[PDB]
């Protein structure tokens with residue numbers, strides 16, 4: 001409906017998540033959904049439905065997040081979704097659970113640190129992300145090559161299809177850790193934005209329930225537990241939990 005009652009009746013919550021954005025949302029070698037956003041999703045299903053296994057996870061491209069929640073394909077988006085005023089015209093955001101800024105990653109042998117360095121060159125972005133929207137709006141002089149999926153986008157960077165790739169910095173730090181010929185040579189392109197769950201526009205019933213759940217997870221340690229399970233192993237002491245988690 002996708003109201004609380006309607007979802008209880010179906011016995012399963014459909015949740016939009018990433019398949020290829022570790023450590024936020026991905027699929028492990030056993031074909032199981034994992035990551036920070038997924039842990040939050042399992043917590044919500046346990047409270048709503050009585051069991052964390054009552055989520056149907058639906059793999060969502062960045063560009064499809066709005067459409068999937070709008071059309072009813074999912075009940076809720078937890079595909080690491082940055083809240084923006086433009087997006088908020090199309091969907092309703094619950095209370096934020098994390099924050100993130102954009103960054104730019106490039107090979108260590110040709111680091112990119114400023115926009116003039118993109119002259120006559122290509123920047124890679126995952127289509128429909130805040131990095132895509134940022135460069136399109138604020139740097140129209142920069143030539144973009146866009147791919148639907150994260151794996152394609154980072155593969156194109158490995159293949160030299162562009163000189164750099166822009167995305168959430170936390171993603172770029174996690175990726176560069178396992179790809180050490182790259183560095184995040186621009187760590188921050190401006191103030192951090194919140195990441196938040198999203199429901200269909202007008203769905204105040206599910207929105208209100210999601211808000212209470214997020215708030216409760218902040219207070220009772222469930223959000224901190226999710227960060228310790230999925231994020232802390234990646235960043236260690238290099239990124240303080242108060243830099244990632246939303247108050």
Ligand SMILES: [Zn+2]
Pocket residue numbers: 009
């Ligand atoms: Zn019915």
Ligand SMILES: [Zn+2]
Pocket residue numbers: 115138139140141
């Ligand atoms: Zn510019």
Ligand SMILES: [Zn+2]
Pocket residue numbers: 061148149
């Ligand atoms: Zn696609």
Ligand SMILES: [Zn+2]
Pocket residue numbers: 147148149152
């Ligand atoms: Zn493709």
Ligand SMILES: [Zn+2]
Pocket residue numbers: 155159
């Ligand atoms: Zn390749």
Ligand SMILES: [Zn+2]
Pocket residue numbers: 177178
């Ligand atoms: Zn490793």
